[PDB]
Every structure is written in C-alpha cells, then in structure tokens.
Amino acid sequence: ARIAGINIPDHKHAVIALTSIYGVGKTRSKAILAAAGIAEDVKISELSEGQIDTLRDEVAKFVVEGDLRREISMSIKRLMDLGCYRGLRHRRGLPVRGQRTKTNARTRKGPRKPI
Amino acid sequence: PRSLKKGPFIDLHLLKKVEKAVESGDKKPLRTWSRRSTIFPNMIGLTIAVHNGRQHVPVFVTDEMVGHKLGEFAPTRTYRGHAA
Amino acid sequence: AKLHDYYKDEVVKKLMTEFNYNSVMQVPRVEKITLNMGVGEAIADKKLLDNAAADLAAISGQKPLITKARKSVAGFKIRQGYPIGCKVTLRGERMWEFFERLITIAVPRIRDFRGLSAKSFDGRGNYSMGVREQIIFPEIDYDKVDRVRGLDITITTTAKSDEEGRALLAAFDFPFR
Amino acid sequence: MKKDIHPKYEEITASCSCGNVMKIRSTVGHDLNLDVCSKCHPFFTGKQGRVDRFNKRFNI
RNA sequence: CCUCCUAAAGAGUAACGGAGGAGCACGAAGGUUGGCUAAUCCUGGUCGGACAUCAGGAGGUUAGUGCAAUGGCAUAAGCCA
RNA sequence: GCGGGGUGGAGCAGCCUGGUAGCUCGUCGGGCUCAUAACCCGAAGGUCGUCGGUUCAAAUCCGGCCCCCGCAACC
RNA sequence: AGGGCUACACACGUGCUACAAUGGCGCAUACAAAGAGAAGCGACCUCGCGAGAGCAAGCGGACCUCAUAAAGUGCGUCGUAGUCCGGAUUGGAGUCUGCAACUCGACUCCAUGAAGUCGGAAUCGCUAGUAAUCGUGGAUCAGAAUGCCACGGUGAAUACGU
Ligand SMILES: [Mg+2]
Ligand SMILES: [Mg+2]
Ligand SMILES: [Mg+2]
Ligand SMILES: [Mg+2]
Ligand SMILES: [Mg+2]
Ligand SMILES: [Mg+2]
Ligand SMILES: [Mg+2]
Ligand SMILES: [Mg+2]
Ligand SMILES: [Mg+2]
Ligand SMILES: [Mg+2]
Ligand SMILES: [Mg+2]
Ligand SMILES: [Mg+2]
Ligand SMILES: [Mg+2]
Ligand SMILES: [Mg+2]
Ligand SMILES: [Mg+2]
Ligand SMILES: [Mg+2]
Ligand SMILES: [Mg+2]
Ligand SMILES: [Zn+2]
C-alpha cells in the first residue's frame, strides 16, 4: 500500500496504482513490474509485504515525488534566474515554447481578465 | 535542438573574436550579431553585446549559461503591458 | 522507558563532559511535550473540533483538553469562551514513549523530509515544530482520514539556552539540517 | 491518570523492513509494519552543471 | 434618582455652572468550602497573517469588577470548581 | 432654536429592532438587424459624508463636526 | 547582418481534440479507392524503446517503393470515477531538415496530467450512397498541416404539407 513514501490505491491494478508516485507513468509502471516480475493485471490488494517492498525497491531506482518536485523546481529556478527568453517567459506566466499569444494560450494565462 | 552528431554551432567571426579576446583578457565588449551562436566554456567572464534588432545588450557571460544560444538574452520585443 | 533510560544512561554523562557541569542536577531534562491543534474552522462545524480531538488522543494515547478562546476577536470571528482547539500535556513515562515513536516512526513518514530546522529555540531552549499531516503517526486509520489536520509539537526543557537545548536534543538523535 | 476516558494503551510490535523490530505502546490495538525508520531513512543515515553536461555531450 | 468637579483638607453648600449615568440584571451573577491570578508585548512555533490555540520569557495589575463615575479590592471584592 | 436626510454614475428601498447590502435607469461584454434604437443573454461597480466613543460586532447607536435642508424667530 | 509579419489585459469568425462505456487500453485479425516519385519514391537486411540511422536492391513506374487502411472483428480488462476519460501546459533527455530550430521548426521517449463532466442569448450544415463517422493521397515545399484540393469504407434520420 505504501510505495515511495506515499499510498497507492488498494482496489486497482498494479500498473494503475503506480501512476500516483509523481514521476512514473505507465511505461515506467510496466518497467517496475517487469524488473520485479509481478503481473500487470494483479491488484496490489493481492500482494504480500515482500512483493510490496520489492515494488518499493524497483521504484527506488528513479527520481520521484520529493526528488522530482524539487529538482524540477531547481530547473525552473535556473530558468527563472538565467534571464534567458525562458526566464522572461516563466517570470511572465506566459507560454514558454513559442505558442501563439494573440489567441487563447489560456492554460498558462488562466481565466479571462476582461479589460 | 541541434542534433549532437554535428556538435554545437558557433559563428566563425564570434569564435575568432572570443578567441583572440580570450588570449588578451577581458577587453571591451565584443558587439556581436550572431544571436545563433552557442555559448562555449571559455567565454566565462566575457562581456559581449548582442543584437535585438536595433540595440546591443551588455551581456556578461557566466558559467551558468553555457550550452545555450546567445540570442536568448536580448529580448527583441518591447512590451511594458497593455493600457499603461 | 526506552529513551528515558537512554537519557539516564548515556545523555547525562555525555552532557556532563560536553559542558563539564558541576552536578547531574545541572544537566537539562525533557520535562513536557505539548501537542496542540488549532481547529478554528469550527465556527460552524462543532463536530470538527470533536473529530480533530478524536485524533489527538489516538496520537497521544491520552484524552486532550479542549481549549477555549481567551478574548473576543472579530478578526477570526470568535468570542471569549468559544473553544477553538485542543492540547495534550505529556509527562513522565508516556512522554518518553511518545517522543521515541516521534523519532523512530513518525518523522520518517513525512513527505519530503529534508532535516528538522534548528531555528526554533525560543531563546531558552524549547523546541516546537509543525506536523502538517496527521498521518505520519500510524494510530490514525488512513482509511478513515475524514480530513487532513495538523498539529504543533512543543518540547519544553530545563535547558537554559538555545545551545544547550540543541545539544540535549542532539544526544537524542534529532535530525537537524 | 484518570480512569474511564483515556484510550486503550498497550504494547504492540512495530516491525520495519530493515530488521528493526521495536516494542512500543500504541492506540492501534494491532501490530505495525513500516517502510522507513530512524535507521533506514535517507536523511537519518546520509542519502540526502552546464560545463559538465556540455563536455559530456559536446566534443570539439 | 446615582457619580465626579465647583465645595474654600469634618458635614453641608447655589447658578439656564462643567462632565457623565439610572428607571435594571442575576436561582446564580446569592451562601459557603477548596483552589487560582491579570493587561500588554517578545521569542519560537502546521495551517494561522497586526490579531485565534500551543510553549517559554519579559511585565507586575498598565488587568478585571453584569451596566456611569468615584472610592475600594491580592486575605482579593477579580477567576474556577 | 427645533427637527430631517446623505447608500456603486443618477434617482431611491434597506434603518425603528448591530450580524444575513436591494430596485430602476445607467456602464462594459456578447447576441439580434444591412446598421441604429427597441429587444435578449451575462458581468462588473457601493464594506454607506469626516470621524471619536460604547460594543462580540457599526450603513443602522450616540456625538465633535460636513453638506444639503426645512418649521421658529414673537410683545 | 540582425529583428519583426509568430507580440498580447481583450473581443470575433473558422476548425481540431474531448467531456467517455454505441467508449478507453493490450493482443491477434480482416475488405479500399485514388494519387507521387531522378539534386527523387526508396524497399530487404541490420541498429535504436521510438522518431530515425547504416549499408544497400527495384522504379521515369498496371512490375519498385511510397504503403501494415482505420472504422470493424474476436479475445481480456476497465465498471461510472474528473476515471485505465481528456491531452493542454511544463521539465529533462532526443532525432532530423536546412548555412542556420534563441526569438521561431517538425516528429520521439520519459515524467506532468490543466480546463472539460454536452455547453446562455443565439446560430450553421445536410432530402442519400447525403449527413455522421473512419482512415487514404496530392499541391505548396530543404524542413515546416488541425487548411485546401482529391479518394474510398461504413452508413443513417426525416420530408403530413407551404
Ligand atoms: Mg509556433
Ligand atoms: Mg467637604
Ligand atoms: Mg472646609
Ligand atoms: Mg446656606
Ligand atoms: Mg439623561
Ligand atoms: Mg475562596
Ligand atoms: Mg463571591
Ligand atoms: Mg405686532
Ligand atoms: Mg501575420
Ligand atoms: Mg502516379
Ligand atoms: Mg510531398
Ligand atoms: Mg487519457
Ligand atoms: Mg510522455
Ligand atoms: Mg473542473
Ligand atoms: Mg466524468
Ligand atoms: Mg478525416
Ligand atoms: Mg515540406
Ligand atoms: Zn527501517
């Protein structure tokens, strides 16, 4: 139930449950359950504590929730402080990869602020 | 980005100017136009002026910018916000 | 009685040589641990204080004292006599048994633990800290987490300075950063 | 201590992955099993850029 | 009708003199026994900020008194059972 | 002297009995028409003349005042 | 030479992707039509998770390549959840085109997983192999399609009447 310092859903499969350790999607999920040999279809409700800590060891081979969160924030802080175009683009809460800003670009800009 | 198989791009004039400026210390700014030059480990300490369309920016090169292009440090558009 | 005997058997001797105190009486003790909970959203949910207090007993092993507002406050919309929290005072055996679990089981289970701060000595050596989630302690059933509440731990001591308190607290393996 | 109001406080076994088996008293009523402990933590035992990756990826 | 000043250090003392309150409340907010001690700020603290609760210090009544003001109140007349 | 009211841009309900800001026209956004008006759909704008006091809390209570005001000024 | 036509409080048209279960994901498996290619289409084979790389046949083409059609089918699971829906944004590591992907490219992998839970006033298209849905190719073009132009597969509803 407890993998990488966090909890995984007991009523779901293994592939799906591991999609909650922020830093592993589906591919890495199949990769864990290959390197550990648990069938992708089994619900972790049906594991033993040893299978569960083997799941912990195989996930332990990556940068995860705390690691990933703060290392990502470190990269975006490098960008923030570099003053490069990505620096201004994150300082501005604007898009950062050249999408159009005449129109929607709303995922960044948020809701509309009418004049 | 540029694929690794080719190596990091650099403009001849930029590289030779930083080169004969390297061997002569931190001289005057090296006003450059090639905003497409990638930055090289030996320019740490250089002050080089880059073009934004009309001006040259006094961009001091640090260790931390290595690997990126030169033109990312000179904004080409001036936007001080709408309805100011 | 695990960490209390660890004090009486290792820590008094270590701090009698660090500072070269005259007598054992001058060596600092860990005299009480106070566990508080501000439940100020209980203005319209009285079941909220009496649920978040139902967790402090499970954390402490001991029924908490419902705490009341001292004065009237239109800022946070309270009145003197309104109970807006709860505390437990731990001493003696149960204090040490809570403290040891706090070391061995409780703080290991915090999301992204980077080392307890050393900036929380109030000038006289007493240590308070925050626990932003009540599920670092295992006595909570994580299946019945009906809300995410926190708490302040406060550890009071006969330590006279910040230095002596961080020292006493360091012969006990507190993870400073 | 007063009677009739405090939870049931008795000693169970907090078993850790590492082989760290400690006896505590607790209001759980049933045994513990842990993933992390004061002697198996990253921090509690010591588990816790551009020129570099340049030379790693770009040869001249 | 109550409090203070005018009122001249006993009492009392006027003006369409200077300032404020009352026309209640409470079966506890009364009796007694046991116990307790404020304001304010400061430092540390999950949320939580000038200001909530916790912990400690400084401070010593600057608090409190069911409602004005004056006189009182720690042995409390203030706070709890 | 006695007695009133002041509340988004304009005009007024909300007060007596301290909590739980409204209407109509206006403004802005979009509709409809060839376009405009009408018509329809949304939204934003007032913590209440300055302010002291009491209070758990003030647009509401009181008052120093501020504006606009009305009835009194007689033998 | 560089910079801009790629901006950005907002408003509008035009489309795409969804909000799921008549559907999503894994597996195998079926039936197209049309069309391009010599400074080009480029197979086999080997190499890389993959986009692609290497070496290397055929074709001025009813022969070679482009180029395995998807819907569908069967098997398994998902079991109504902001989800095994959604794929925006964002970080890292990438490939390739062309001197040259900072402004400002197109695709890959990993991680992230936003709004969105069927849409106010209003308003558009279609009377049949039509709408609806599902893939295919072409021009432009070094690279740079959710657009246009063209091609099939499945395949409706309804028309009293003016
Ligand atoms: Mg673009
Ligand atoms: Mg007298
Ligand atoms: Mg006298
Ligand atoms: Mg007389
Ligand atoms: Mg009166
Ligand atoms: Mg008494
Ligand atoms: Mg009394
Ligand atoms: Mg007359
Ligand atoms: Mg244009
Ligand atoms: Mg042809
Ligand atoms: Mg082509
Ligand atoms: Mg999805
Ligand atoms: Mg991915
Ligand atoms: Mg939503
Ligand atoms: Mg849904
Ligand atoms: Mg199509
Ligand atoms: Mg092209
Ligand atoms: Zn352990």
From Swiss-Prot, chain D:
GO terms of molecular function: rRNA binding; structural constituent of ribosome; zinc ion binding
InterPro entries in UniProt: Ribosomal_bL28/bL31-like_sf, Ribosomal_bL31, Ribosomal_bL31_A, Ribosomal_bL31_sf
Free-text remark on how the cofactor is bound: Binds 1 zinc ion per subunit. Only 1 ligand appears to be Cys, the other are thought to be His and either backbone amides or solvent.
Superkingdom in the source lineage: Bacteria
GO CC annotation, single: cytosolic large ribosomal subunit
Modified residues (N6-acetyllysine): K8
Key words of the record: Acetylation, Metal-binding, Ribonucleoprotein, Ribosomal protein, RNA-binding, rRNA-binding, Zinc
GO terms for biological process, alphabetical: cytoplasmic translation; negative regulation of cytoplasmic translational initiation; translation; translational initiation
One Pfam family named in its UniProt record: Ribosomal_L31
Family: Belongs to the bacterial ribosomal protein bL31 family. Type A subfamily.
Role according to the record: Binds the 23S rRNA.
Quaternary context: Part of the 50S ribosomal subunit.
Name of the protein in its database record: Large ribosomal subunit protein bL31
Species annotation: Escherichia coli (strain K12)
